[PDB]
Amino acid sequence: NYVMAIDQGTTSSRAIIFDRNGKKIGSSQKEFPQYFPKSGWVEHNANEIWNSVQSVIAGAFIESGIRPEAIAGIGITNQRETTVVWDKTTGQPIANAIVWQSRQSSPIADQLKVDGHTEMIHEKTGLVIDAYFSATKVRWLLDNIEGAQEKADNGELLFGTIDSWLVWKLTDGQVHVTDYSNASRTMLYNIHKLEWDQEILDLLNIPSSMLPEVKSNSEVYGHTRSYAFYGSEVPIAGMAGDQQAALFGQMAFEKGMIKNTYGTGAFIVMNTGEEPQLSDNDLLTTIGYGINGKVYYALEGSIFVAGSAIQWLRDGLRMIETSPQSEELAAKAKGDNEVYVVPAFTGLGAPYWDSEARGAVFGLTRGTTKEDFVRATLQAVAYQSKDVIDTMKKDSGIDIPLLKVDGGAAKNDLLMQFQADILDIDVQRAANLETTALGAAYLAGLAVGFWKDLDELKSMAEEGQMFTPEMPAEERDNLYEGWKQAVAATQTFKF
Amino acid sequence: NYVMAIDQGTTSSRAIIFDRNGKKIGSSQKEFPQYFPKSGWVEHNANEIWNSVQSVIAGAFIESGIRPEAIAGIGITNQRETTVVWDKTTGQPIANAIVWQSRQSSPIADQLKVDGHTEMIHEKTGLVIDAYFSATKVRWLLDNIEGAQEKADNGELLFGTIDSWLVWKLTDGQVHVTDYSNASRTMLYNIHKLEWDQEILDLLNIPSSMLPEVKSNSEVYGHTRSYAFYGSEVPIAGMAGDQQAALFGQMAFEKGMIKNTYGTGAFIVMNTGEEPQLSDNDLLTTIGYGINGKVYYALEGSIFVAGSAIQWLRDGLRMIETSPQSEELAAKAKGDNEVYVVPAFTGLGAPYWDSEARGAVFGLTRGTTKEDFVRATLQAVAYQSKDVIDTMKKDSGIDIPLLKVDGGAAKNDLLMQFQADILDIDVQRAANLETTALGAAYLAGLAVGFWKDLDELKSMAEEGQMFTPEMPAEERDNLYEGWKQAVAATQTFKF
């Protein structure tokens, strides 16, 4: 009667039990520790990630009353790029996972750019050389953890993005698999030919004995053998990197269809059908998902720092008491809107890909208030999303009249209205802001035949909220122009 | 037996009684209202300024026990540029005073540059065309206050900077005067020929009937006829703009001696002897003081926003509860000193004179704390003061080995050591940070023979402390590099 989704996020994990109608019948959420050993580094402990996941599985069962034997399948979805390396026999990570947020491995990406590898790597993976992606993280771990390169060389070490790490734990070590969307983010996988790339692996000295089998996004990978499911061998049947799962949960199945998820980072992903579309040094060409013997590619713009800028306001400046306070403060801003925050703490993501940029603020006067400051900080995401979406218009030739939206931070009505005004395009927000987890559930539920099809269409389609652009061209243009100026000035600070 | 100095500053006034040894016997200080009717305007009510001054005169008398008949002369010192225009017969300001801080008349200053007068004004006044100075504020009041141009044309209105206003009020309207230093700030006075400049008055259609008589900085201007001094015709005998009063108070009497006052703004002033130095269009050539028949000139770099950045923290961001708290927060910063705050809310002052720049922040990361942000905001003034002092050693061939410092904010020992460190120059620090009020009292006391001469020397020089540069070249150069980047980037945001 139900499908469980596990959504293993950057700051928290969640498990959600959905029924045949696509409705939430049970759920549990648990934060886990974030580690910053040096500025610019972000790590997680993959065991503490795994316990967070055990906790929410058990929690969703405990609170709902539902037991494992009622679950038709499990979908898994996850913060992408984040890299685990673990000993195959003891199942222990050789060190902390390194988060997609981290830039600890940036020297290794810099050297790759120095040695001339840009276009080769972009033509195989669709990606920009950067420490965002898993390849340099696996190289970092092989360079810096004593003994590890030799073990990997001896076949004793496994690599996994978090999806892979989860299925391995959930099967108690039986299955080492990743799906095409997560593999496409490692910068080790050739997204054209659909295989791990030997040349990139030899170049970074990564033995291929580390690597999981890659499979589609909707098939039974294996069955649980695990405490919180115990005794049921529940099929693990749906897997996608979170931003692709969101793309899926949006039903963005046709070429051109685009969503943005507003969370710790924000990720604009457009389905480009069964063929990949050309790059530049601006968007990423990536894999949406593989299902029904077909692979759908996607174009993506990545905005690394979005809701985590709010967390900085809370934690770093202590300007706000909690993160929900940002929305109240910002609603109360009285300034002309001439302050701009460009919270690019770790570098600017799409369409700039400038790793050396850091966060900056512009247009401050003696009248600037806490409220003005918080609002500017929120609006950065909507402006950079425009940067992205206009680039995708240019790169796609595809005019875009509808942006679908989801993610915890999409709950802010004024932000969503600003986003539509600034874009001059309609913005439709999902009823259930966790379409990430729904997308994983849909993939799992199709695999095990809980749902027969994609055209069990928007059968289920509860969702609505439409934000229609109501800002005149003049205002919208002056706003965006100040943003572009702020970004160009941010880029000139290269100390 | 005693001298009183009145220091009418930007946010408060103060009155100090000093004995013949220069010691403080009594003081009183009192804030008065600040008005900001539009973003970038700053105004005072001149009547409120006058009541704040009667208030602090009375308080110094009440708290010291000294009485007006025991006061040998009065010195007067004031926020400069700040412009008051009044009716000679009612005594009433035609409108709010317009503060040196405001830029409301900046369209007037732009049109003067457009019309090609920059070199003419600079040659005559030593100054850069800007709405910082009194000239465009008078023109603004004559543009904007109904009927005032015709009254001024009819000889019915008087202009004065705040020294001139307080002497008018203290003598019950019998004396309309200003000293060389304050008049040098108006951009209406020719500091070479030592007269009001007729060509500049015609250009700005300001009638000479508005203008006070311009006199030396140490002579009997008149006598009080006023409540707080009632029954004593107390000699009013010393007057300088607050910053030239600081230079005097510090005994920087010789060519090359230089001070910095850390106050609301920060203003570095070097005595250039009896000739001017050549300025760049990057420093101001101004009058330091006229005494003993001679006129001493000065070079100055003005930094508009220094301690007012810290009031912005308090009142705009509410990042700090009180201004003093800044010191504590910054002392506690653990970041690597890579955040820069360029708090140029009203434009950049010297050496930039960029009226379009606004406040900006750079180098922010997830680890930036309140304490780092506060510390960067405090260090701005030290970095800009080095821009200025380097410019000055550049325009005048001469190493500067010692900067004397005063002002409220020089009480911050860490900011002073940082100041010395990044300069590689010794920094002294006056024993009494009210060297402004001291320099005024000196000027009044020389004039009435209370002290006989300048070489009643350093006789009284009661003082030092000392901050010796102790940061290596590598560290200072990197700190500074990052500051020049941040300002270059701030000047690129020209939205």
Swiss-Prot record, chains A, B:
InterPro entries: ATPase_NBD, Carb_kinase_FGGY, Carb_kinase_FGGY_CS, FGGY_C, FGGY_N, Glycerol_kin. Keywords: ATP-binding, Glycerol metabolism, Kinase, Nucleotide-binding, Phosphoprotein, Transferase. It comes from the Bacteria. It catalyses: glycerol + ATP = sn-glycerol 3-phosphate + ADP + H(+). GO terms for cellular component: cytosol. Pathway: Polyol metabolism; glycerol degradation via glycerol kinase pathway; sn-glycerol 3-phosphate from glycerol: step 1/1. SUPFAM superfamilies: Actin-like ATPase domain. The keyword Phosphoprotein applies. It holds the Pfam family FGGY_N. Activated by phosphorylation and inhibited by fructose 1,6-bisphosphate (FBP). Sn-glycerol 3-phosphate binds at T10, R80, E81, Y132, D242. ATP binds at T10, T11, S12, T264, G307, Q311, G408. ADP binds at T10, R14, T264, G307, G408, N412. PROSITE patterns: FGGY_KINASES_1, FGGY_KINASES_2. The modification Phosphohistidine is found at A228. Glycerol binds at R80, E81, Y132, D242, Q243. GO terms for molecular function: ATP binding; glycerol kinase activity. GO terms for biological process: glycerol catabolic process; glycerol metabolic process; glycerol-3-phosphate metabolic process. Its EC number is 2.7.1.30. Key enzyme in the regulation of glycerol uptake and metabolism. Catalyzes the phosphorylation of glycerol to yield sn-glycerol 3-phosphate. HAMAP family: Glycerol_kin. Belongs to the FGGY kinase family. Homotetramer and homodimer (in equilibrium). This is Glycerol kinase. The lineage of its organism: Bacteria, Bacillati, Bacillota, Bacilli, Lactobacillales. The gene is glpK.
